[PDB]
């Protein structure tokens, strides 16, 4: 099937104070073992928040809700380096012991890698999406995926969401 990473929202409309949930997932990524993404939004329209608790995202907040790369036997490592004030989310996650992971002979190729809450501050048309950044040269529209050999994966689609109209 089609290999891709996508950001999608549970709802397209809402009231001020409502928390829209953006789910980031991957589909059919061969030998997937890690990633890093850069997502941008308009901070005066939406506010990045934990989809569950509702706590405000800070520079070190790592998004929850993933269904892949959770096996402690391969030491998953999470990294967050956001800039909420500028409407920028940048985080990464990967198994450290990829050699052990490859030994199982079965990779986790489809699933959720992040769930992000976006609280509606204004009733206006806005968009959020993956976007390239200087700290990720050679990236695919602000995304980089890696296999269990530690190499960058290429050729997949980056499906942009939004068109959030209100």
């Amino acid at each position: 099937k089609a290999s891709s990473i996508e950001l999608k929202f549970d709802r397209n409309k809402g009231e001020v104070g409502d928390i829209l949930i953006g789910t980031v997932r991957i589909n059919n990524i061969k030998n997937f073992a890690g990633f890093q993404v850069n997502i941008v939004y308009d901070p005066k329209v939406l506010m990045a928040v934990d989809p569950e608790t509702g706590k405000e995202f800070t520079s070190s907040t790592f998004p929850p809700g993933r269904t892949v790369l959770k096996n402690n036997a391969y030491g998953p490592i999470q990294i967050a380096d956001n800039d909420p004030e500028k409407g920028i989310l940048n985080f990464a996650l990967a198994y450290s012991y990829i050699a052990g992971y490859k030994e199982t002979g079965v990779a986790e190729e489809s699933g959720i890698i992040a769930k992000i809450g976006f609280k509606i501050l204004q009733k206006k048309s806005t968009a959020v999406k993956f976007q390239d950044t200087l700290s990720m040269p050679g990236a695919i529209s602000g995304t980089q995926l890696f296999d269990w050999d530690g190499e960058v994966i290429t050729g997949y689609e980056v499906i942009q969401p939004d068109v959030l109209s209100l």
């Binding site: 890093q36 990464a92 450290s96 990829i98 050699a99 980089q144 190499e151």
Partner: protein, 156 residues
């Protein structure tokens, strides 16, 4: 004396512009002697004036941020190519906090400079593993290639 030569190649992907930077600097020394050499931009090294030794010598390869490698039984009965361009000696990067072990402390050092770009206050070239101008997850994944390894993990 004879000439002991070969080629060395780091175990990760890199483009043509950085090749000269990542293939140079590997110190090759014959254990128990004062004979040694450092690879040039082509990953090539050549030690000269080496006495014959039917009972092969032991060589040690080292470089900052890399895991030391020991190669025993290098027989020298004349000029000898330890390795070739076609089949070079591989070296593993990731032993940042020198302790002969690729572990979480090493990954933590790269993390301290996460997302740093060339010329930035937090950018350190040696931590920019593939030297593409930014320190990020791509570099960490390279270190992960040999997470948990010690010198003895190299093929003997």
């Amino acid at each position: 004396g004879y000439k002991v030569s070969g080629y060395i190649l780091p175990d990760f992907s890199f483009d043509a512009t950085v090749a000269p930077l990542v293939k140079a600097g590997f110190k090759v020394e014959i254990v128990g002697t004062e004979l040694y050499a450092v690879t040039d931009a082509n990953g090539y090294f050549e030690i000269t004036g080496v006495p014959a030794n039917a009972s092969g010598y032991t060589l040690k390869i080292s470089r900052a941020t890399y895991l030391d490698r020991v190669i025993a039984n290098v027989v020298v009965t004349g000029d000898t190519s330890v390795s070739t361009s076609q089949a070079p000696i591989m070296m593993w990067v990731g032993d940042i906090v020198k302790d002969n072990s690729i572990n979480l402390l090493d990954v933590a050092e790269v993390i301290r400079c996460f997302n740093a770009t060339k010329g930035s206050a937090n950018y350190v070239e040696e931590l920019d593993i593939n030297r593409n101008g930014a320190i990020n997850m791509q570099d960490i994944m390279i270190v992960h290639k040999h997470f948990g390894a010690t010198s003895s993990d190299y093929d003997a």
